[PDB]
Amino acid sequence: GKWVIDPSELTFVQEIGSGQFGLVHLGYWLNKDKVAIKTIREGAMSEEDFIEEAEVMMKLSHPKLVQLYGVCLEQAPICLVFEFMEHGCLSDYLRTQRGLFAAETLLGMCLDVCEGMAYLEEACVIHRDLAARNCLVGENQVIKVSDFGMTRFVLDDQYTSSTGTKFPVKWASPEVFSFSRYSSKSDVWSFGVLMWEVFSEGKIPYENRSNSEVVEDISTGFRLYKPRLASTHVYQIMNHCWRERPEDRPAFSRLLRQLAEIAES
Ligand SMILES: C=CC(=O)N1CCC[C@@H](n2nc(-c3cccc(C(=O)Nc4cccc(C(C)(C)C)c4)c3)c3c(N)ncnc32)C1
């Protein structure tokens, strides 16, 4: 089928950087385009579960979502082929350009991510690991969401267990760090942390807290402070994303209207 890419259809030009459990290269895909190619090391992911879901994932086509183009599975290590995002991760894009962006621009970056997340929410697809590190920057400074649902395939328990050393506790809602209870409402909590990373120009949330300290702090009502560039209205929306009860958090469809209201007026 079309989703399978033959090794003869790909060339590797240069490294982009280290991804999770594998290297990412810049390359070309025959008769198509420039692409980013991930080589995944053996044992890191459930390749069979991923191959079963690949065609399904490839139908989640939205301009604010980084596209999966196909899979090169002929030989180990398998390759995953994606839409190439010229300006890389949003985390480094902000950190290297501190002082450049106006709040209107930072809000527009949050609006791009929110639009991609409202599409996934309508499709009943949970991201599970939304953070600035997997939002990528493309043409005309567009931000696109990447790696939605990919943690379903990770095999290292240090990453998947809510108590594992590499679990993204900093972006987790309490029902996720307590019970791994994923939903679009737990993605909303993560989106609030993403808004904080954006308005802080790429600062690390809860920088001097261990993961166990973040659990206790969040459970006892602590919340991230307001970034200097965030207005009080922006910070109010961040706090709505961090409500303890998932039912009290806004849906992405509601956030998209609230943030656009601020952006368009
Ligand atoms: C800060 C520096 C930065 O910019 N980085 C870090 C190094 C790699 C860069 N990178 N990563 C991707 C990219 C985009 C989407 C998915 C993946 C992926 O491999 N999923 C992925 C593939 C297979 C398995 C898994 C598991 C989670 C299951 C382990 C994940 C990779 C990418 C792209 N398309 N265009 C440009 N650069 C890109 C991002």
CSV table of N, CA and C and ligand atoms in Angstrom, one decimal, residues 16-18 20-21 24 36 38 40 45 66 80 82-85 88-89 92 136 146-147 150 153-154, ligand 1:
chain,number,residue,atom,x,y,z
A,16,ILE,N,19.4,16.2,11.1
A,16,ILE,CA,18.7,17.3,11.7
A,16,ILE,C,19.0,17.4,13.2
A,17,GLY,N,18.9,16.2,13.8
A,17,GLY,CA,19.2,16.1,15.2
A,17,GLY,C,18.7,14.8,15.8
A,18,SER,N,19.0,14.6,17.1
A,18,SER,CA,18.6,13.4,17.9
A,18,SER,C,17.1,13.6,18.3
A,20,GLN,N,13.6,11.2,19.9
A,20,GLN,CA,13.5,10.2,20.9
A,20,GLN,C,13.8,8.9,20.4
A,21,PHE,N,14.8,8.2,20.9
A,21,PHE,CA,15.2,6.8,20.5
A,21,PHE,C,15.6,6.7,19.0
A,24,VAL,N,17.1,11.9,13.5
A,24,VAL,CA,16.3,12.6,12.5
A,24,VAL,C,17.2,13.2,11.4
A,36,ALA,N,11.6,15.0,6.6
A,36,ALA,CA,12.4,14.7,7.8
A,36,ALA,C,12.2,13.2,8.0
A,38,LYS,N,13.0,9.9,10.4
A,38,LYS,CA,13.4,9.3,11.7
A,38,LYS,C,13.8,7.8,11.6
A,40,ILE,N,14.3,4.7,13.9
A,40,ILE,CA,14.0,4.3,15.2
A,40,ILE,C,14.8,3.1,15.6
A,45,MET,N,10.0,1.0,20.2
A,45,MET,CA,8.6,1.1,20.0
A,45,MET,C,7.9,-0.1,19.6
A,66,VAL,N,1.8,18.4,11.9
A,66,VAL,CA,2.9,17.9,11.1
A,66,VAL,C,2.5,16.5,10.5
A,80,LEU,N,10.5,6.4,9.7
A,80,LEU,CA,9.3,7.1,9.6
A,80,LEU,C,9.5,8.4,8.9
A,82,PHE,N,8.3,12.2,7.6
A,82,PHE,CA,7.4,13.3,7.9
A,82,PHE,C,7.7,14.5,7.1
A,83,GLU,N,6.6,15.3,7.1
A,83,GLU,CA,6.7,16.7,6.6
A,83,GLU,C,7.9,17.4,7.3
A,84,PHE,N,8.7,18.1,6.5
A,84,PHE,CA,9.9,18.8,6.9
A,84,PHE,C,9.5,20.2,7.4
A,85,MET,N,9.9,20.5,8.7
A,85,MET,CA,9.6,21.7,9.4
A,85,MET,C,10.8,22.5,9.4
A,88,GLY,N,12.4,24.1,12.8
A,88,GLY,CA,12.6,23.3,14.0
A,88,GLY,C,11.6,23.4,15.2
A,89,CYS,N,12.0,23.0,16.3
A,89,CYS,CA,11.2,23.0,17.5
A,89,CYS,C,10.9,24.3,18.0
A,92,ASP,N,13.3,25.6,21.1
A,92,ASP,CA,14.6,26.3,20.8
A,92,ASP,C,14.4,27.6,20.0
A,136,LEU,N,6.4,22.4,16.1
A,136,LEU,CA,7.5,22.7,15.1
A,136,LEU,C,7.1,23.9,14.3
A,146,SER,N,3.1,18.2,16.4
A,146,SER,CA,3.7,16.9,16.0
A,146,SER,C,3.6,15.9,17.1
A,147,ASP,N,3.8,14.6,16.7
A,147,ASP,CA,3.9,13.5,17.6
A,147,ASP,C,2.7,13.1,18.3
A,150,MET,N,1.8,9.4,19.6
A,150,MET,CA,3.0,8.5,19.5
A,150,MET,C,3.4,7.8,20.7
A,153,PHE,N,3.0,4.0,21.5
A,153,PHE,CA,3.9,3.0,21.0
A,153,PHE,C,5.2,2.8,21.8
A,154,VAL,N,5.5,3.7,22.7
A,154,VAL,CA,6.8,3.7,23.4
A,154,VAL,C,6.9,2.4,24.4
B,1,LIG,C1,14.9,21.1,19.2
B,1,LIG,C2,15.4,20.7,18.1
B,1,LIG,C3,14.5,20.2,17.0
B,1,LIG,O1,14.1,21.0,16.2
B,1,LIG,N1,14.1,18.9,16.9
B,1,LIG,C4,14.8,17.8,17.7
B,1,LIG,C5,15.5,16.9,16.7
B,1,LIG,C6,14.5,16.4,15.6
B,1,LIG,C7,13.7,17.6,15.0
B,1,LIG,N2,12.5,17.1,14.2
B,1,LIG,N3,11.7,16.1,14.6
B,1,LIG,C8,10.8,16.0,13.7
B,1,LIG,C9,9.7,15.0,13.8
B,1,LIG,C10,8.3,15.4,13.6
B,1,LIG,C11,7.3,14.5,13.9
B,1,LIG,C12,7.6,13.2,14.5
B,1,LIG,C13,8.9,12.9,14.7
B,1,LIG,C14,9.3,11.5,15.2
B,1,LIG,O2,10.4,11.1,14.9
B,1,LIG,N4,8.4,10.8,15.9
B,1,LIG,C15,8.5,9.5,16.4
B,1,LIG,C16,8.8,8.5,15.4
B,1,LIG,C17,9.0,7.2,15.8
B,1,LIG,C18,8.7,6.8,17.2
B,1,LIG,C19,8.4,7.8,18.1
B,1,LIG,C20,8.1,7.4,19.6
B,1,LIG,C21,7.6,8.5,20.4
B,1,LIG,C22,7.2,6.2,19.6
B,1,LIG,C23,9.4,6.9,20.3
B,1,LIG,C24,8.3,9.1,17.7
B,1,LIG,C25,9.9,13.7,14.3
B,1,LIG,C26,11.0,16.9,12.7
B,1,LIG,C27,10.4,17.4,11.4
B,1,LIG,N5,9.3,16.8,10.9
B,1,LIG,N6,11.0,18.5,10.8
B,1,LIG,C28,12.0,19.0,11.3
B,1,LIG,N7,12.7,18.7,12.4
B,1,LIG,C29,12.2,17.7,13.0
B,1,LIG,C30,13.0,18.4,16.1
